[PDB]
Amino acid sequence: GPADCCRMKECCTDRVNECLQRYSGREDKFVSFCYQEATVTCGSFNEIVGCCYGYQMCMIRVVKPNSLSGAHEACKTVSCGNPCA
Amino acid sequence: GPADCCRMKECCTDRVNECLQRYSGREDKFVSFCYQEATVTCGSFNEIVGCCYGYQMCMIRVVKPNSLSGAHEACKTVSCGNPCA
Amino acid sequence: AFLTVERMVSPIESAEDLSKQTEIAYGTLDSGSTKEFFRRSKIAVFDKMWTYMRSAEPSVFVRTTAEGVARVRKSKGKYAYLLESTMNEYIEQRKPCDTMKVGGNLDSKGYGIATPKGSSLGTPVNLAVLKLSEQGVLDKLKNKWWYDKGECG
Amino acid sequence: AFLTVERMVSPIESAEDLSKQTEIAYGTLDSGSTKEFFRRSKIAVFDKMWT
Amino acid sequence: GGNLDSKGYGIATPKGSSLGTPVNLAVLKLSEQGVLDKLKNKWWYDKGECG
Amino acid sequence: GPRKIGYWSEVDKMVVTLTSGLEQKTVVVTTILESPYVMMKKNHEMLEGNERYEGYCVDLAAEIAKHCGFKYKLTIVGDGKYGARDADTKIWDGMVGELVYGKADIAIAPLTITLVREEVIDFSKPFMSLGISIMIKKPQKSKPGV
Amino acid sequence: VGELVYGKADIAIAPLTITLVREEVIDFSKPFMSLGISIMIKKPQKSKPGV
Amino acid sequence: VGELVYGKADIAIAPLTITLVREEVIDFSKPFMSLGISIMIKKPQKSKPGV
Amino acid sequence: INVGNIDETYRSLFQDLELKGERRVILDCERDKVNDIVDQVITIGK
Numbered sequence: 205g206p207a208d209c210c211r212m213k214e215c216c217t218d219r220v221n222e223c224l225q226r227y228s229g230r231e232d233k234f235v236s237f238c239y240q241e242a243t244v245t246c247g248s249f250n251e252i253v254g255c256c257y258g259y260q261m262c263m264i265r266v267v268k269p270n271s272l273s274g275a276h277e278a279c280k281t282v283s284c285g286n287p288c289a
Numbered sequence: 290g291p292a293d294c295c296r297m298k299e300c301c302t303d304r305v306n307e308c309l310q311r312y313s314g315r316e317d318k319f320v321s322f323c324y325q326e327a328t329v330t331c332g333s334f335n336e337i338v339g340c341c342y343g344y345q346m347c348m349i350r351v352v353k354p355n356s357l358s359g360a361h362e363a364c365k366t367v368s369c370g371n372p373c374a
Numbered sequence: 375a376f377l378t379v380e381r382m383v384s385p386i387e388s389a390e391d392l393s394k395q396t397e398i399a400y401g402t403l404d405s406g407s408t409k410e411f412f413r414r415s416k417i418a419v420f421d422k423m424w425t426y427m428r429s430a431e432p433s434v435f436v437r438t439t440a441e442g443v444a445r446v447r448k449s450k451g452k453y454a455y456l457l458e459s460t461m462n463e464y465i466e467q468r469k470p471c472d473t474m475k476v477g478g479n480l481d482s483k484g485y486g487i488a489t490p491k492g493s494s495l496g497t498p499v500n501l502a503v504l505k506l507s508e509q510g511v512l513d514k515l516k517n518k519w520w521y522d523k524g525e526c527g
Numbered sequence: 528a529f530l531t532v533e534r535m536v537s538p539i540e541s542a543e544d545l546s547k548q549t550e551i552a553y554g555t556l557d558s559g560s561t562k563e564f565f566r567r568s569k570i571a572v573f574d575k576m577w578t
Numbered sequence: 579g580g581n582l583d584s585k586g587y588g589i590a591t592p593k594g595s596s597l598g599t600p601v602n603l604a605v606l607k608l609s610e611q612g613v614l615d616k617l618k619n620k621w622w623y624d625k626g627e628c629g
Numbered sequence: 630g631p632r633k634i635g636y637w638s639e640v641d642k643m644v645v646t647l648t649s650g651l652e653q654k655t656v657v658v659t660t661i662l663e664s665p666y667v668m669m670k671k672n673h674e675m676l677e678g679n680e681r682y683e684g685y686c687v688d689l690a691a692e693i694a695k696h697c698g699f700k701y702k703l704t705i706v707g708d709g710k711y712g713a714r715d716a717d718t719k720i721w722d723g724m725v726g727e728l729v730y731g732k733a734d735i736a737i738a739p740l741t742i743t744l745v746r747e748e749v750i751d752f753s754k755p756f757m758s759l760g761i762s763i764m765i766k767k768p769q770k771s772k773p774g775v
Numbered sequence: 776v777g778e779l780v781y782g783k784a785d786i787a788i789a790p791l792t793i794t795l796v797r798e799e800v801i802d803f804s805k806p807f808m809s810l811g812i813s814i815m816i817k818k819p820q821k822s823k824p825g826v
Numbered sequence: 827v828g829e830l831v832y833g834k835a836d837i838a839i840a841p842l843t844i845t846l847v848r849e850e851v852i853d854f855s856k857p858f859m860s861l862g863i864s865i866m867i868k869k870p871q872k873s874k875p876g877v
Numbered sequence: 878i879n880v881g882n883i884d885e886t887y888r889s890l891f892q893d894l895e896l897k898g899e900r901r902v903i904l905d906c907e908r909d910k911v912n913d914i915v916d917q918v919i920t921i922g923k
């Protein structure tokens with residue numbers, strides 16, 4: 205019933221990061237894929253946008269092979285942007 | 290710059306409560322008003338919906354005269370519903 | 375009835391036909407993917423066209439698009455300009471409305487956002503373009519800057 | 528009016544026109560990029576059509 | 579009428595595959611060589627029975 | 630621990646006594662002046678910065694930056710060409726050049742996708758469709774005839 | 776609405792349209808008149824006759 | 827209205843016409859629909875005869 | 878994971894590792910225990 209954008213955000217970042225740990229060393233190439241996994245698991249307000257767009261972009265624009273931990277730790281506090289459009 | 294739904298939620302609840310402590314004994318009647326102040330201050334994705342709708346409704350359905358503190362403390366953890374529609 | 379209906383028939387000059395005639399001169403941009411197309415093309419018709427434009431005098435090539443169109447307008451319809459689709463549609467939708475797009479297109483391609491190889495921006499920009507595509511943003515932008523305010527009927 | 532109808536021959540041009548009438552039924556493939564487009568699309572006309 | 583959206587087909591590969599870049603370049607050259615157009619013609623209009 | 634933030638005099642009342650890095654990079658966007666892609670505004674002479682330009686590529690640049698989350702600076706290409714490599718010097722000219730030699734971080738413009746460029750740079754999926762077409766002067770309406 | 780919120784007036788009798796934005800900051804009685812946004816254009820003249 | 831006043835139900839969602847007689851015993855939300863007393867007759871025979 | 882207090886269990890742990898995608902492992906053990914663990918690794922093809 206109740207859906208919260210905040211809880212959806214936390215779940216989003218967490219599921220992305222938890223996904224990226226399966227692909228370790230290849231992470232930079234799998235960021236988008238794992239993001240869609242988080243979007244589809246935690247649900248989204250807009251199917252197109254995903255659970256947190258800003259996070260996806262920040263990560264995809266930062267994550268390097270075996271750089272995961274610091275990348276996620278720096279990207280999870282970022283603003284999700286607009287969940288609608 | 291980029292606006293975050295989560296940060297907007299926190300700001301919403303906080304600004305609502307900060308407004309409602311201006312009015313005492315009538316709080317239950319001014320809850321909606323204070324909500325529009327939080328919506329107009331912290332901004333919203335949809336002007337109609339506001340910054341956090343679920344919070345506003347939870348408060349309107351709870352707040353009693355001089356019941357403010359406990360009402361707010363129980364309503365800020367509620368799900369925002371949805372900022373879009 | 376038939377007088378009530380009107381409309382019009384679309385004139386088509388094609389391309390190969392343009393290759394076969396010496397009457398109407400034609401050319402392209404001074405330096406561009408279009409010119410480079412005509413040059414580098416191993417196809418018969420286009421090869422012929424390129425040979426013609428290459429040895430045609432005076433030079434049928436133009437420095438800019440505006441210059442080319444302006445040359446098309448003052449040529450009494452005796453000069454054709456080979457330009458990219460978009461630019462043609464745009465000039466066609468703006469006054470004096472003396473130009474036109476004739477026949478089909480010579481090739482099918484697209485524009486794109488370019489980044490230096492290995493740039494961080496590459497994938498996010500790509501996904502951004504994909505999203506703008508599905509959201510109709512690209513189409514709406516095209517309309518805004520082409521057909522929406524268009525000045526010919 | 529008959530030979531006038533002859534040029535009245537083309538009622539449906541765009542998609543929007545088809546969206547506004549329930550007379551002519553319409554649909555897409557069961558599973559494909561097309562259907563998923565209609566679903567995931569928040570665009571007005573397509574939204575109506577998908578609904 | 580026209581088309582509802584503007585998109586394209588493409589050669590798909592699994593993420594991080596080596597074939598991704600070469601296949602891409604290959605499609606580009608086939609495009610510039612006119613192979614793609616001629617191929618569509620071969621399988622569409624050339625034998626076209628409606629004229 | 631405790632520290633003095635100021636003092637209070639018999640008159641002056643409350644007097645408060647005593648008491649840079651980490652920023653995001655500006656992205657340089659190279660574009661060419663072509664209508665209706667990038668055009669100068671009517672009053673651009675009185676305006677400065679990215680408020681000078683307007684067009685499809687301008688709006689697309691704004692959108693792309695907003696999605697990717699970077700501060701962008703629109704800059705027209707120096708030589709005024711799209712891109713090419715001199716068969717002699719093997720040197721790239723135009724926007725493609727500014728990408729290769731790193732004069733610009735990204736290029737948003739009507740840059741036609743070509744294999745020759747696709748080898749030296751990265752191209753996003755196409756944001757617009759086109760093809761080489763023919764332009765002629767609009768013919769006279771003439772007459773119906775006998 | 777301003778004179779109501781800041782208490783310059785005890786009540787407002789006027790063609791004050793009910794809007795949710797106002798309903799949150801003030802009290803509105805049940806509607807005494809119905810309306811909606813409508814279009815006004817200059818009436819086409821039956822004029823310009825003749826031979 | 828009875829089920830509301832005597833507390834058989836917590837709320838009433840229905841085509842309940844707002845009336846002064848009820849407004850005293852119950853609370854009415856802003857009206858969600860407009861209507862009025864109208865006349866219903868059988869559809870007269872189609873088209874028309876005449877010179 | 879303490880491997881000194883313990884065959885099937887090894888297959889289990891390496892199974893969940895395979896699913897979690899943790900390839901990297903550090904063997905801190907006696908020479909004998911190392912040999913054992915490696916043998917169990919080869920048998921189930923990890």
Ligand SMILES: CC(C)S(=O)(=O)NC[C@H](C)c1ccc(-c2ccc([C@@H](C)CNS(=O)(=O)C(C)C)cc2)cc1
Binds near residue numbers: 482507512585756757
């Ligand atoms: C998926 C979308 C982002 S999109 O389809 O890529 N772009 C949207 C935009 C309206 C658009 C749509 C379609 C096309 C397009 C243009 C040409 C082709 C074929 C004929 C050649 N492909 S190519 O990439 O240009 C070539 C140089 C190899 C295929 C598709 C170009 C741009």
Ligand SMILES: N[C@@H](Cn1cc(F)c(=O)[nH]c1=O)C(=O)O
Binds near residue numbers: 405742
């Ligand atoms: N955009 C092209 C350059 N370009 C531009 C034009 F307007 C044109 O008519 N022909 C052309 O090659 C490229 O990127 O090479």
Ligand SMILES: N[C@@H](Cn1cc(F)c(=O)[nH]c1=O)C(=O)O
Binds near residue numbers: 792
């Ligand atoms: N009555 C409206 C104001 N108001 C008045 C008009 F005559 C009109 O055409 N539009 C409008 O918004 C309100 O209550 O704000």
Ligand SMILES: N[C@@H](Cn1cc(F)c(=O)[nH]c1=O)C(=O)O
Binds near residue numbers: 841842843844
């Ligand atoms: N809605 C009315 C009752 N009611 C219902 C009808 F269907 C009708 O035709 N007339 C009427 O008075 C009420 O609120 O009492």
